[PDB]
Structures are given as structure tokens and as C-alpha cells.
Amino acid sequence: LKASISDYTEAEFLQLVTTICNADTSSEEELVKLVTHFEEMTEHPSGSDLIYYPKEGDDDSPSGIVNTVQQWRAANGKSGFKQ
């Protein structure tokens, strides 16, 4: 499921990001915990700003978010999605 981003396929990570974006949770706590997990998986310096306070012109749509993460990891010497 979730130890590091390399345990995620790109589809499954898109699932996680879609859930966060829609706040499709049962409590604020569960949402907070998912967003925390996301940050931990991506390791991106912006943390939860990738989802909530995107840069000017950045696609903050779910697919948009996964691309941004995907391109940053690649460009930063980190492992990518499973497979």
C-alpha cells in the first residue's frame, strides 16, 4: 500500500491524491493523516503546498499533482513509481 513512493504504482498514487483533493474522508483527522502521508511519500520541500497552495500556472488537479511529483522526483535523483 504505502511504505515509500516506490510502493505506489502511478495509478494508485493518483487514487491517493484524488481522495485528498476531494477530502473523501470521514474526519478531519483522517484527511490530515493522508496529507501527512503524501508529504512523507513525495519528500517534496513544499509539503502540503503541492495540493493546497500551488504555484502560479501549476496544474493543481489530481493528475496535475501526480505529474508535478513525478517530474520533481525524476529531476531530483529519487526513485519513482512502482513498476
Partner 1 sequence: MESKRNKPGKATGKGKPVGDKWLDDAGKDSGAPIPDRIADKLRDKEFKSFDDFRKAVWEEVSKDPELSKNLNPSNKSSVSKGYSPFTPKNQQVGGRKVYELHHDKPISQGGEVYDMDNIRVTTPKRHIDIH
Contact flag: residue 60 with partner 1 (CB under 8 A): yes
| Angle of CA points 5, 80, 63, to nearest 5° | 80
CB of residue 22 to partner 1, shortest distance in Å: 5
**For residues 69 and 60, is the Cβ–Cβ distance under 8 A?**
no
Looking at residue 1, what DSSP letter applies? -
Please say whether the dihedral angle defined by the alpha carbons of residues 42, 43, 44 and 48, taken in this order, is positive or negative.
positive
Segment interacting with partner 1, rule: CB under 8 A, options 1-9, 49-57, 72-80 = 49-57
**Applying CB under 8 A, which of residues 9, 11, 40, 52 lies at the interface with partner 1?**
52
Among 6, 10, 12, 47, interactor with partner 1 by CB under 8 A: 47
* CB-based contact 58:64 (threshold 8 Å): yes
Task: For residue 14, state whether it binds partner 1 (rule: CB under 8 A).
Answer: no
Binding site for partner 1 (CB under 8 A): 20-23, 25, 28, 31-32, 35-36, 46-49, 51-54, 60
